[PDB]
UniProtKB/TrEMBL annotation, chain A:
GO terms for biological process: photosynthesis. Keywords: Chloroplast, Membrane, Photosynthesis, Photosystem I, Plastid, Thylakoid, Transmembrane. This is Photosystem I reaction centre subunit VI. Belongs to the psaH family. It is found in: Plastid, Chloroplast thylakoid membrane. Its main location: plastid. The keyword Transmembrane applies. Possible role could be the docking of the LHC I antenna complex to the core complex. One of its GO terms (cellular component) is chloroplast thylakoid membrane. The chain holds residues 43 to 133 of 133 of the full protein. It comes from the Eukaryota.
From TrEMBL, chain B:
PsaA and PsaB bind P700, the primary electron donor of photosystem I (PSI), as well as the electron acceptors A0, A1 and FX. PSI is a plastocyanin/cytochrome c6-ferredoxin oxidoreductase, converting photonic excitation into a charge separation, which transfers an electron from the donor P700 chlorophyll pair to the spectroscopically characterized acceptors A0, A1, FX, FA and FB in turn. Oxidized P700 is reduced on the lumenal side of the thylakoid membrane by plastocyanin or cytochrome c6. It comes from Coccomyxa subellipsoidea (strain C-169) (Green microalga). The chain crosses the membrane at residues 21-43, 84-105. This is Photosystem I P700 chlorophyll a apoprotein A1. The chain holds residues 645 to 751 of 751 of the full protein. Chlorophyll b 35 binds at H60.
Automatic annotation (TrEMBL), chain D:
One of its GO terms (biological process) is photosynthesis. It comes from Coccomyxa subellipsoidea (strain C-169) (Green microalga). It is found in: Plastid, Chloroplast thylakoid membrane. Keywords: Photosynthesis, Photosystem I, Thylakoid. Its main location: plastid. It is a peripheral membrane protein. Belongs to the PsaD family. This is Photosystem I reaction center subunit II, chloroplastic. One of its GO terms (cellular component) is chloroplast thylakoid membrane. Transmembrane segments: none annotated. Coiled coil: none annotated. The keyword Thylakoid applies. PsaD can form complexes with ferredoxin and ferredoxin-oxidoreductase in photosystem I (PS I) reaction center. PSAD may encode the ferredoxin-docking protein.
TrEMBL record, chain E:
It is found in: Cellular thylakoid membrane; Plastid, Chloroplast thylakoid membrane. Chlorophyll a 18 binds at N71. Chlorophyll a 30 binds at T68, N71. The chain crosses the membrane at residues 6-27. PsaA and PsaB bind P700, the primary electron donor of photosystem I (PSI), as well as the electron acceptors A0, A1 and FX. PSI is a plastocyanin/cytochrome c6-ferredoxin oxidoreductase, converting photonic excitation into a charge separation, which transfers an electron from the donor P700 chlorophyll pair to the spectroscopically characterized acceptors A0, A1, FX, FA and FB in turn. Oxidized P700 is reduced on the lumenal side of the thylakoid membrane by plastocyanin or cytochrome c6. Belongs to the PsaA/PsaB family. This is Photosystem I P700 chlorophyll a apoprotein A1.
């Protein structure tokens, strides 16, 4: 019998935990306490979106304005060979 | 691949006219045609064709030339079979003419 | 080394005799790519007479195959248990078809 | 006749399992149960793939779709000459009896049934779609 | 039949992985070449993908008459290594080396 | 003769105002 | 859900009901045809839209019509 | 369930990924939205039209701004034949240094794109000269876009919402659009040409700060008011005039010279001014035809009801058609799209042969790009015209209200129309393909003298009647003593006959048997595309296979495998099939334009004349021969500025091929595949921690046809655009 109406609908529908185990004690207390106070302001979904937005946008424009120049991207050096020559005497 | 194999090596089949290899140039073109022809069977569906045949059958009925064996569009499965048969024939014969003209002329 | 194999000749009509290319050996025809010449040379065939003999013998055997298909359907049709002798068929096709075929070809 | 109750103590057929059975939908949306009474122990084809052995006497089988239950029931009726019952089971424990809805198979006409979807006209008498613009109806068949 | 979903899903993943890591290498190369970055390409003169297993197989089959097939005078084919076989001033067979392009097309 | 920086900033500011009006129209069309 | 409407040309042949793979249709008593029955569609929430019923119908034109509508889990034939 | 398709509760309750796709695809079908009324539908359309107008003006502002900021417009103005016009700058961080060097062109300080849109020639012709002029125009158009957006918001407010009856006032809208939107706009454009563009063509710098000080004509407005209008035609610009300078210039402002300015190879600006002035007067007059609020003018319903032949040849005639057209937005959109798309084709045919902008004819890449662009746009628009005709027949057509009129009567012999379209398509295809294949076999067998080369004597006779003396037909404008000749001899015939008898322009090109064959291919394409579209529109309401098709709507997948099978039976599917044929037809048209002009521009007309009579000639001498520079845009030896077109060429081939997957493989294969994938995710550890919100399903049948067609079309267009621009610009 693989069916039961009440108190075994979890077994009937196969709602089992194959690998998850109940456990409260995994990490050290000071390590955990450190990481809860580290990630405390980002535990709100609006704050993390604001933080990732501001940081990512600032990193991207700082890369574009300055960082791309520092790593010497070819688009920031520009041409040095005077320009490609077109046909029919066109410039 | 596109330039140095397909574009460069097709020079023999497309210059084959007026030589004994001209049959390969003609088959190259005809196989391109048969391949393209297959796309009408693969991309369409028989409901359109049956309705078009209804109008054509009206024209034959008006002139008393409607056949007794009632014309139907091909079945859905036959439409697929015709499409894949002409697709394979056209593509493979294209490569056949390309290969044979190329390697006979430069071999 | 210099002569291109050819075993198909077209008739002169509607200009198609251009396909009888100058393949060498004082001969005009369509160049073949099936490899028969190399196979006939490896077999030791040196003349058109031996090619004629194989062609005649093949047609006789072709008639024998068509006779057998008519015979084993219309005159002496094997029963189902004959076909289901897979052990006998494997023994005969391994030793008799492939084995004696390879021995005779080695001969 | 009254709608039967799903007996949860019914045994299941002998099956080695497969990858084609129930998924998370059975836990959170719905699933289905087909029950039948077998005259003898015999092999039948699962609608989810693979051979299974129906036990002699009452059998119970849980399936993901109503169509799977009706496919198995069609096999039971046409190959084994066996009738069956189909239920819909909800995650809250509610069991809804589905088929045959009034105890008689739907292909057999039965008194007490009322027509729904009947139109008192031939199909060519439907009105034009311009006549149902800005009315909220589903189409000309809806009026 | 009872685990067809596992078979088909695993094969689906294999096909997606193979398509990405075979055709996307070509797309990477076309994009790098168009952008004027041949040093960023998958090539024999850039980021290399050498088919080292097939190269080792070739070396093993070349060295076979020495040790592992002592009574065979020569390897089975010139494609493994060694000298050009020339007939009538044309190459009959020669070693077929395998580099990055061969890796890419085999995948 | 090239444009000035101020001309580019003028064009960008007028485009920002136009974009605000566009967002206003899009929201009005929505609801 | 799909809408399955029945019309009055139905000859009560029951073939559409037998064809239905999800038990949408059933035969109910009627006086409009010789067979004294008509197809009915009480369970269109289970209709997948396969139009096996229309393929089974012998009348010209059809007496059972399926109008594909808003899609649900049942009408999409999903087991997941 | 969700709230994204808030206009459709049926889509909002869909638990699958189909809800998102269909929510996007049905967003602009306002008539099918939940709880929509006719008045709110019209108001939403009015505001959407304001939004589209604002987008158009912003797009034009962006083109002007990027040319002013990053282009080389003053340098091009100095040397229009030897400067490549710059579209905009490139800032791509993926570029290598060779790509940075290769794309630096036109005298720019960095990598740029060279424009193919012809805006330099147009803006220079209409009098713009500096970067400041372009910038001021761009700022003005951004402000215009803001005004349009504000008006769109404003007329959605309840006290400014127009009533439904205002939208159905046809007579007032036609009066105003003809008189003001066409006529007054053309009159104001004549004002711009006379006050600004013509003086700037003569070296006179006229702008906002001095145009009230500058005399457009030396005698002012006295010849206009007195009626002595021939004063304005005296002393035109001479044949030795240098454009943009006072050397060789005249003082005329309204002329009828005909033909081309010898230096710019374009139409005379004074001719253009007189054209737009006459157009202004004709359109202002035509805008006084219909009755509004003053007791005079025509009533269109009574005009239509009056036009029924008394012999009964058209039945009830046009009776009731006013309400049919006026109540159906799809009839109106179908008419608008048919007319606008035909006009787009007319623009394409007339701008290559009668170039209106200075130094446009010498810019070969730009001319080819503009012709191809407008012909493909015209093809898509014509497909849409017939699509909305079919939609009208399904959704809006009332047979009782149209009893016996021309619409009902053409529906009543739809089999005759469709069967005759089928016959003409079959005849054209059989014989055009047969003649081409015969010629191909003749060339293959070494005997080109056995080709069937039919001389296009009818079109050559037309060219002779318009004055081309090359063919020896002496009639009308090619007969020096004819009445038609003598009438135009002092006005426009000298310039016109100089232009039409010169082979150095595109005005009525010399034609021969290759032109015959390709024109019959074009006729085959037009007739077959029309056959598919017309059969779709006329069978939209029903056919013998599906007599109740109107009950199912314009677009639906099929009616199932019964009755033999009914794939692609909807009118939408006829649109989908016809797009392939339209793309094929415009492909043939544009191939013809480009190859004939390639021979003319390279100074070798014999290549087209000899090779176009057989299809190997097209393949080898057009596609294969001209792809050589394009596919060498990047190679193992390096890259050049054509590498972007080589990459886009391959990109288009890839997108085209990807479309074949959606078009060839159909739904149920993918649905079963996705079922196995959904099993795999639920059973995979560390991945089944995440779940989908929408149940993944295969794309629908119709959606697949759409997506496959979109990939096919996009790949088609991208491939040909890359080939066209690369092949023309690598030589020129
Ligand atoms: C003149 C000799 C002859 C005659 C009068 C018959 C008469 C009959 N046979 Mg044969 N039979 C014969 C010789 C003959 N058979 C031969 C030589 C073979 C060996 C192939 C057979 C093997 C055979 C089988 C296996 C079957 C028959 C069956 C039949 C019956 C009808 C089918 C039929 O003939 O369709 C006429 C068909 C054709 C004319 C097409 C044949 C195409 C041939 C093989 C050439 C292939 C195409 C060619 C390569 C070109 C391709 C391009 C009929 C009683 C069938 C039957 O009894 O019930 C269904 C049956 O199953 N026969
Ligand atoms: C060139 C044409 C083309 C392409 C690209 C595909 C694509 C695919 N086919 Mg389809 N197919 C085609 C033609 C094509 N087909 C045609 C004409 C038919 C009709 C017969 C089919 C019928 C068909 C069947 C029956 C099946 C496929 C399957 C597949 C997949 C193989 C797995 C794979 O390689 O994933 C990798 C994807 C690619 C290699 C495509 C290119 C991806 C690029 C390189 C990555 C780019 C990412 C991009 C840069 C990031 C996004 C950025 C952007 C959004 C801004 C893949 C999705 C099989 C599949 O589903 O099994 C898993 C399958 O069973 N196809
Ligand atoms: C000429 C361009 C044009 C115009 C005038 C409109 C006009 C309209 N659209 Mg259409 N749209 C366009 C282009 C356009 N759209 C393109 C290219 C797409 C993708 C194919 C769409 C897809 C789309 C969807 C899916 C929806 C609209 C809706 C709307 C209405 C409200 C728009 C809005 O700003 O809501 C502002 C609302 C928000 C910002 C919050 C909700 C987000 C909405 C639901 C989706 C975003 C809509 C927006 C137009 C997408 C822009 C696409 C972008 C690539 C250009 C309005 C009638 C919505 C409407 O309700 O239908 C009548 C609607 O649901 N549009
Ligand atoms: C003088 C009065 C007047 C004017 C100027 C307009 C102007 C306009 N109305 Mg009409 N309107 C009027 C009175 C007027 N209206 C009245 C009295 C009513 C009620 C009875 C209406 C009711 C009305 C409605 C309901 C709608 C309009 C809309 C429109 C716009 C049409 C779209 C467009 O831009 O076409 C541009 C057309 C031209 C410029 C004419 C030329 C067309 C040809 C084919 C082009 C070729 C010209 C030339 C060769 C091209 C040169 C190209 C260049 C690049 C070189 C346009 C802004 C629609 C809309 O868009 O607005 C929101 C709309 O939905 N109007
Ligand atoms: C001898 C005198 C005479 C002549 C020759 C005409 C001629 C005409 N009148 Mg009549 N008329 C007359 C006396 C005359 N009228 C008198 C005394 C009055 C009273 C004042 C009228 C009042 C009147 C009215 C009120 C109207 C006409 C109209 C017409 C036209 C259509 C009539 C018809 O039935 O078409 C029959 C047409 C068909 C049955 C359809 C044929 C469709 C063909 C087969 C399609 C072919 C398409 C082709 C294959 C595709 C392209 C070809 C390709 C090569 C490009 C026609 C020009 C109508 C009109 O058109 O006015 C402009 C109209 O409304 N007349
Ligand atoms: C002035 C031009 C114009 C206007 C106002 C409309 C307006 C409309 N069209 Mg028509 N149409 C046009 C030109 C136009 N179209 C052209 C040029 C074509 C040829 C391609 C069509 C072919 C066409 C078809 C085949 C259909 C419409 C449909 C629609 C409606 C919904 C559109 C939608 O939601 O798309 C959403 C679009 C997207 C999500 C993007 C699609 C992919 C793009 C190409 C990228 C709406 C009434 C539909 C309809 O009315 O149903 C009955 C419909 O089925 N149009
Ligand atoms: C190269 C590709 C190709 C070809 C040749 C055709 C051919 C045809 N199309 Mg199809 N089409 C195509 C691609 C093609 N299509 C694609 C990709 C689509 C999108 C799905 C369509 C969608 C489409 C629609 C929707 C319609 C057509 C129609 C037509 C016909 C147009 C009229 C005509 O030209 O008659 C001349 C006929 C031909 C040129 C066909 C080839 C004739 C051959 C060469 C005759 C000789 C055969 C040879 C001697 C036999 C040897 C056999 C051998 C085994 C012995 C014709 C049958 C229309 C139609 O049916 O009108 C009547 C129609 O409504 N097409
Ligand atoms: C030639 C005169 C005869 C034409 C036949 C007249 C006849 O057939 O009447 C039919 C129709 C005119 O019909 P209405 O109803 O306008 O007039 C009835 C006629 O009989 C005139 O009284 O004519 C045509 O549509 C064909 C000729 C149009 C030609 C227009 C060319 C411009
Ligand atoms: C730095 C600075 C600043 C800032 C600025 C900014 C931040 C700017 C930006 C700008 C921008 C950022 C702009 C933009 C623009 C936009 C636009 C202009 C848009 C438009 C759009 C449209 C037009 C739309 C349309 C539509 C659609 C698409 C769909 C739906 C419908 C509609 C119609 C709505 C300031 C002043 C504070 C200060 C000083 C410094
Ligand atoms: C389906 C439908 C529809 C649609 C339709 C369409 C889409 C159509 C198209 C159409 C078209 C697209 C048409 C076109 C046509 C054109 C024409 C008809 C033209 C004419 C011309 C002429 C008449 C001219 C003459 C001349 C002159 C003036 C000068 C010299 C030269 C000549 C002689 C040539 C609708 C919506 C209505 C409705 C519903 C249904
Ligand atoms: C073109 C097309 C058709 C129309 C094609 C048809 C009906 C096939 C026509 C084949 C031949 C030409 C019909 C006539 C055969 C007779 C034996 C001819 C006798 C005449 C002598 C000259 C031989 C479909 O029916 C169809 C169905 C499903 C998917 C796609 C398509 C599809 O693409
Ligand atoms: S469409 Fe299919 S599921 Fe729906 S009533 Fe008909 S047969 Fe039954
Ligand atoms: S609807 Fe058709 S199939 Fe069903 S009972 Fe009536 S006649 Fe028979």
């Amino acid at each position: 019998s693989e069916y039961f109406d009440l108190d075994d609908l979890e077994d009937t529908t196969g709602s089992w935990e194959l690998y998850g185990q109940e456990d409260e004690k995994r990490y050290p207390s000071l390590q955990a306490e450190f990481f809860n106070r580290a990630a405390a302001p980002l535990t709100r979904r609006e704050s993390l979106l604001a933080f990732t937005f501001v940081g990512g946008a600032g990193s991207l424009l700082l890369w574009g304005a300055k960082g791309s120049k520092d790593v010497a991207l070819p688009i920031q050096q520009g041409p040095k060979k005077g320009g490609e020559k077109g046909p029919r005497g066109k410039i | 691949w596109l330039r140095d194999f397909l574009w460069a090596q097709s020079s023999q089949v497309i210059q084959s006219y007026g030589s004994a290899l001209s049959a390969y140039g003609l088959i190259f073109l005809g196989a391109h045609f048969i391949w393209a022809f297959s796309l009408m069977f693969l991309f369409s569906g028989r409901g359109y064709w049956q309705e078009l045949i209804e109008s054509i059958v009206w024209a034959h009925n008006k002139l008393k030339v409607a056949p007794s064996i009632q014309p139907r569009a091909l079945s859905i499965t036959q439409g697929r079979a015709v499409g894949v048969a002409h697709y394979l024939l056209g593509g493979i014969a294209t490569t056949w003419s390309f290969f044979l003209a190329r390697i006979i002329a430069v071999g | 080394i210099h002569i291109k194999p050819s075993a198909q000749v077209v008739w002169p009509v509607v200009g198609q005799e251009i396909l009888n290319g100058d393949v060498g050996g004082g001969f005009q025809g369509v160049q073949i790519t099936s490899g028969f010449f190399q196979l006939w040379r490896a077999s030791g065939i040196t003349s058109e007479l031996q090619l004629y003999s194989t062609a005649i013998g093949g047609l006789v055997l072709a008639a024998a195959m068509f006779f057998a298909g008519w015979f084993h359907y219309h005159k002496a049709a094997p029963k189902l248990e004959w076909f289901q002798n897979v052990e006998s068929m494997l023994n005969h096709h391994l030793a008799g078809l492939l084995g004696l075929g390879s021995l005779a070809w080695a001969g | 006749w009254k709608p039967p109750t799903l007996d949860p103590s019914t045994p299941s057929p002998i099956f080695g399992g497969s990858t084609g059975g129930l998924l998370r939908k059975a836990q959170i949306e719905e699933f289905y149960v087909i029950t039948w009474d077998a005259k003898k122990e015999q092999v039948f084809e699962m609608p989810t793939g693979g051979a299974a052995i129906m036990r002699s006497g009452p059998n119970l089988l849980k399936l993901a779709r109503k169509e799977q239950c009706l496919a198995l029931l069609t096999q039971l009726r046409n190959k084994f000459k066996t009738d069956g019952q189909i239920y819909r089971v909800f995650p809250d424990g509610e069991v809804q009896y589905l088929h045959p809805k009034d105890g008689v198979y739907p292909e057999k006409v039965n008194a007490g049934r009322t027509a729904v979807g009947a139109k008192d006209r031939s199909i060519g008498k439907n009105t034009n779609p311009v006549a149902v613009k800005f009315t909220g109806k589903l189409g000309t068949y809806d009026v | 039949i009872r685990h067809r979903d596992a078979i088909v899903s695993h094969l689906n993943w294999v096909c997606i992985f193979l398509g990405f890591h075979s055709f996307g290498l070509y797309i990477h190369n076309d994009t790098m070449s168009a952008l004027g970055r041949p040093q960023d390409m998958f090539s024999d003169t850039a980021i290399q993908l050498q088919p080292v297993f097939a190269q080792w197989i070739q070396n093993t089959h070349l060295s076979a008459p020495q040790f592992t097939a002592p009574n065979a005078l020569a390897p089975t084919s010139p494609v493994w290594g060694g000298d050009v076989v020339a007939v009538g001033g044309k190459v009959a067979a020669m070693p077929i080396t395998l580099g990055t392009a061969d890796f890419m097309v085999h995948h | 003769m090239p444009l000035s920086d101020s001309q580019i900033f003028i064009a960008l500011f007028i485009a920002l105002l136009t974009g605000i009006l566009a967002v206003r129209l899009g929201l009005e069309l929505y609801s | 859900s799909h809408a399955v409407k029945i019309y009055d040309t139905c000859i009560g042949c029951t073939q559409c009901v037998r064809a239905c793979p999800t038990d949408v249709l059933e035969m109910v008593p009627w006086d409009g045809c010789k067979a004294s029955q008509i197809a009915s569609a009480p369970r269109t929430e289970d209709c997948v839209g396969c139009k096996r019923c229309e393929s089974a119908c012998p009348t010209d034109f059809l007496s059972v019509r399926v109008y594909l509508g808003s899609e649900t889990t049942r009408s999409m034939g999903l087991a997941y | 369930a969700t709230k994204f398709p808030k206009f459709s509760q049926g889509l909002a309750k869909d638990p699958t990924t189909r809800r998102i796709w269909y929510g996007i695809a049905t967003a602009h079908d306002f008539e099918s939205h939940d709880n929509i009324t006719e008045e709110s539908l019209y108001q939403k359309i009015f505001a959407s039209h304001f939004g589209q107008l604002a987008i158009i003006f912003l797009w034009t502002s962006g083109n002007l701004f990027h040319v002013a900021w990053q282009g080389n417009f003053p340098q091009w103005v100095q040397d229009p034949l030897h400067v490549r016009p710059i579209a905009h700058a490139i800032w791509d961080p993926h570029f290598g240094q060779p790509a940075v060097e290769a794309f630096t062109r036109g005298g720019a300080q960095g990598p740029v794109n060279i424009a193919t849109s012809g805006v330099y020639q147009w803006w220079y012709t209409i009098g713009l000269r500096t970067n400041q002029d372009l910038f001021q125009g761009s700022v003005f158009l951004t402000i215009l876009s803001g005004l349009f957006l504000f008006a769109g918001w404003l007329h959605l407010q309840p006290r400014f919402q127009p009533a439904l009856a205002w939208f159905k006032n046809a007579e007032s809208r036609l009066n105003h659009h003809l008189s003001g939107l066409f006529g007054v706009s053309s009159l104001a454009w004549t004002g711009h040409l006379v006050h600004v563009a013509i003086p700037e063509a003569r070296g006179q710098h006229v702008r906002w700060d001095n145009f009230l000080t500058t005399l457009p004509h030396p005698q002012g407005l006295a010849p206009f008011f007195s009626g002595n209008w021939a004063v304005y035609a005296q002393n035109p610009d001479s044949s030795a005039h240098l454009f943009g300078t006072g050397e060789g210039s005249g003082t005329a402002i309204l002329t009828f010279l005909g033909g081309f300015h010898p230096q710019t190879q374009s139409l005379w600006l004074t001719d253009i001014a007189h054209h737009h002035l006459a157009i202004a007067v004709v359109f202002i007059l035509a805008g006084h035809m219909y009755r509004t609020n003053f007791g005079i003018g025509h009533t269109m319903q009574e005009i239509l009801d009056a036009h029924t032949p008394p012999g009964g040849g058209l039945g009830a005639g046009h009776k009731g058609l006013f309400d049919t057209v006026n109540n159906s937005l799809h009839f109106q959109l179908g008419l608008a799209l048919a007319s606008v798309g035909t006009i787009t084709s007319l623009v394409a045919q007339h701008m290559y042969s009668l170039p209106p902008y200075a130094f446009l004819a010498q810019d070969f890449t730009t001319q080819a790009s503009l012709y191809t662009h407008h012909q493909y746009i015209a093809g898509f628009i014509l497909c849409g015209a017939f699509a909305h005709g079919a939609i009208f027949f399904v959704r809006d057509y009332d047979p009782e209200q149209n009893k016996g009129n021309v619409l009902a009567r053409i529906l009543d012999h739809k089999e005759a129309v469709i069967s005759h379209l089928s016959w003409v398509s079959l005849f054209l295809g059989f014989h055009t393909l047969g003649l081409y294949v015969h010629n191909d076999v003749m060339q293959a067998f070494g005997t080109p003298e056995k080709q069937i080369l039919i001389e296009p004597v009818f079109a050559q006779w037309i060219q002779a009647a318009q004055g081309k003396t090359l063919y020896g037909f002496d009639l009308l404008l090619s007969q020096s003593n004819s009445a038609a000749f003598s009438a135009g001899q002092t006005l426009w015939l000298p310039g016109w006959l100089d232009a039409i008898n010169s082979n150095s322009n595109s005005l009525f090109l010399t034609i021969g048997p290759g032109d015959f064959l390709v024109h019959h291919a074009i006729a085959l394409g037009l007739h077959t595309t029309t056959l598919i579209l017309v059969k779709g529109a006329l069978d939209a309401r029903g056919s013998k296979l599906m007599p109740d098709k109107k009950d199912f709507g314009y677009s639906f997948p099929c009616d199932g495998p019964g009755r033999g099978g009914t794939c692609d039976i909807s009118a939408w599917d006829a649109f989908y099939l016809a797009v392939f044929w339209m793309l094929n037809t415009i492909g043939w048209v544009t191939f013809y334009f480009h190859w004939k002009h390639l021979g003319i521009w390279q100074g070798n007309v014999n290549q087209f004349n000899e090779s176009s009579t057989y299809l190997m000639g097209w393949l080898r001498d057009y596609l294969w021969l001209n792809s050589s520079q394009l596919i060498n845009g990047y190679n193992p030896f390096g890259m050049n500025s054509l590498s972007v077109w080589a990459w886009m060429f391959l990109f288009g081939h890839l997108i085209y091929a990807t479309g074949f997957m959606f078009l060839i493989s159909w739904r149920g294969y993918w649905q079963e595949l996705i079922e196995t994938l959904a099993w795999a995710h639920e059973r995979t550890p560390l991945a089944n921690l995440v779940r989908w919100r929408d149940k993944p399903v295969a794309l629908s049948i119709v959606q697949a046809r759409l997506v496959g067609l979109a990939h096919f079309s996009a790949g088609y267009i991208l491939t040909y655009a890359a080939f066209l621009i690369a092949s023309t610009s690598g030589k020129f």
